[PDB]
């Protein structure tokens, strides 16, 4: 141990530091964190030592409950890691996982936005589905509409999860505009093999069952556009148009939609 401490003071590479921490791997936690701070003050921007530091810190800090000065030290060394390892997405994923462990919402959104700032365009795919999990873990949709708007701005072939989120978190009007603007596009992959009929039927059923939420779009124009789009499966869309008139309270209009449903 004194010769090992002298060798660790005389050497500089990451393997001697890792061997010294593996030698002193007991529970020296305050002196261990002091030796971590001294070793990273001598050697900055070393990914292996920084990842081992944050992994050992997050493994050892678990006795604290929710809000502790130990957790504030964990957060402060997380941005001290992010000074140089901002381009590394794994430490960003570790801090966001620890932020769902802690329970912060707006600071987790701020650090996800800072991760989107830090990773230029290439490594956003390693951090974006964890942000979708973050927005699905919170039932309030006011942040999640703009977050999934940013995800559709980045990757447009993901609107089906947004439609499922808005049909699970009752933003039915915005679900209707998003469904109507994804089903009429030419190139879109729903990753389920819908063949552009199940999306039309889901849009028609969602705008049929709940017409009071949908107060901006033209329901009849959208469903007649779908009816002119198809030639083989018109009956479900005709039932959906008259069922829109049923939930709108227009029984005579539903009878008339059935009348040219017969006629056309």
């Amino acid at each position: 141990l004194p010769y090992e401490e002298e060798i660790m003071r005389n050497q500089f590479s990451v393997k001697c530091w890792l061997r010294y921490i593996e030698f002193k791997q007991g529970a020296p936690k305050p002196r261990l964190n002091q030796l971590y701070e001294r070793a990273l003050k001598l050697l900055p921007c070393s990914y292996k030592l920084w990842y081992r530091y944050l992994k050992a810190r997050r493994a050892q800090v678990k006795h604290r409950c929710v809000t502790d000065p130990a957790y504030e030290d964990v957060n402060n060394c997380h941005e001290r890691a992010f000074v140089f390892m901002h381009k590394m997405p794994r430490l960003w994923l570790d801090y966001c996982q620890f932020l769902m462990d802690q329970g912060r919402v707006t600071h987790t959104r701020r650090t996800f936005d800072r991760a989107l700032r830090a990773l230029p365009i290439t490594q956003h795919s390693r951090i974006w589905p964890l942000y979708l999990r973050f927005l699905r873990s919170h039932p309030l949709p006011e942040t999640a509409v703009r977050g999934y708007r940013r995800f559709l701005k980045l990757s447009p072939e993901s609107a089906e999860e947004y439609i499922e989120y808005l049909k699970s978190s009752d933003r039915l009007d915005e679900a209707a505009q998003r469904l109507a603007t994804v089903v009429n596009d030419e190139r879109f992959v729903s990753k389920a093999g819908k063949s552009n009929y199940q999306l039309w039927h889901e849009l028609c059923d969602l705008i049929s069952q709940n017409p009071d939420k949908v107060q901006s779009l033209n329901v009849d124009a959208i469903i007649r556009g779908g009816l002119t789009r198809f030639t083989d499966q018109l009956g479900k869309l005709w039932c959906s148009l008259a069922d829109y008139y049923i939930r709108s309270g227009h029984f005579e209009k539903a009878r008339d939609v059935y009348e040219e449903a017969i006629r056309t």
């Binding site: 000074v83 140089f84 901002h86 700032r117 006011e142 107060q215 901006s216």
Partner: protein, 527 residues
Amino acid sequence: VFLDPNQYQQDMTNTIQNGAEDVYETFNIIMRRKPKENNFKAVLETIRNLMNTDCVVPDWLHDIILGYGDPSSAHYSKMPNQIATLDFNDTFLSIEHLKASFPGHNVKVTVEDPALQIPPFRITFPEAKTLIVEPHVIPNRGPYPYNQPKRNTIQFTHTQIEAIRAGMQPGLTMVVGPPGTGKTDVAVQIISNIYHNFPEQRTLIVTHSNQALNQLFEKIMALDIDERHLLRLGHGEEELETEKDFSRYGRVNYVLARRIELLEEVKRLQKSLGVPGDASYTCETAGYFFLYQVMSRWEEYISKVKNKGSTLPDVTEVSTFFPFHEYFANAPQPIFKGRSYEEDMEIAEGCFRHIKKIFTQLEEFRASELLRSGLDRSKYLLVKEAKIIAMTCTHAALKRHDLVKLGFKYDNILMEEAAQILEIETFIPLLLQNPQDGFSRLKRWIMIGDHHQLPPVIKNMAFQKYSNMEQSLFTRFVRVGVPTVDLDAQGRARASLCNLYNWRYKNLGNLPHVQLLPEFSTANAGL
């Protein structure tokens, strides 16, 4: 050419059924018109877009615009989320002016020492007339001599200060200023108080005539408002302003030059602190350079000084342990005069606050760095960065399609000379944005004008006589019965001149501190 589509569809359904001659196949004269009057199609497109979007007008302005129900429900005294805490930098020149300019209100000053009773003030607004006023101090802006510009020196009247008090609160308010009262100073004090209380809020300022818009825009440079949040799109930009600019590219290049200068200051601080690295820093690397080298050095600095310690730290300890002595060599030496420990700590906190101002300005410029194209940078300037946006009614009706194309949002709306601004010219800049997800961003709607003043420039006598289309929205909101703030004391004209037209206004009095000047004490020579 883009032809009229509805008229074209009418021509095709006319010429194939009734057998009439085709309109668009026999044209022989092309007609062009002058600019600034060729924008009526943009006005009609703005009206058609506002008709097509269903719920642009909020519910708290719906019954006020339509005039139904109680006409005094637009007043600030009937609203449950009324703002209590308000900051006033240069509205009040003295504590006795603050006492004399609040009629019907008791002033509870939190301090008893008149030496600390100085502007700026913070007033908490509602026994029921108690105003909890504390005179606070400005933060130290650094060791630079020229870091504080000229503030307001106009001593407003109690009605003019009550106009600002109604203008700070959300809702509809009006400033009825007769010619003589000087409503321009009240307008720029409203703008300065909005910018100082809520710097994240965005203010739209609309004036119809470009000369009066330039006159309102010139006074902002003589206030405590930074010029990087200003924007004025339009063809009436031609004023006497020295740095020119004030456009979409014209403030984005100023943002880039300020970012270059602050990154040069960051490089100078890096060479002062001896951090390794000679290449130029980005805004992200500047923020992480702050959070690693400036924040940690300030942490060990305040730990070694021990401000939160058992005993009082030494005055010279700040000067010995300050790590930015060689960075501020352009400042007049010494940085710390050594008179007192808390004064030296105030100078050190001013240096750190100027450093944090530079670093948070670079954090704001980080998003301008993140966008590649200058169109995206101008969009960022138009939506997020610029907090003061100066329009005319005609240019707002021109660019209302482009503002909703670029996602323009605001917080407060001001129209100056609301009798010179027409009623549709009042309604058009009211609705430049649209509500998204059931949320309206509109809080304040301030009409600064005079319903006894002129109707605007209408070139037909019959429309402005018979149809009453020259009646402004200001005059209509007076004539329904909304309570108005009629300014009383006039501060640029002679009292015998004011006595000739004071009968048109509700108690148009005279301000005595202007009338005791030697120009108003004497009369006209030779008469």
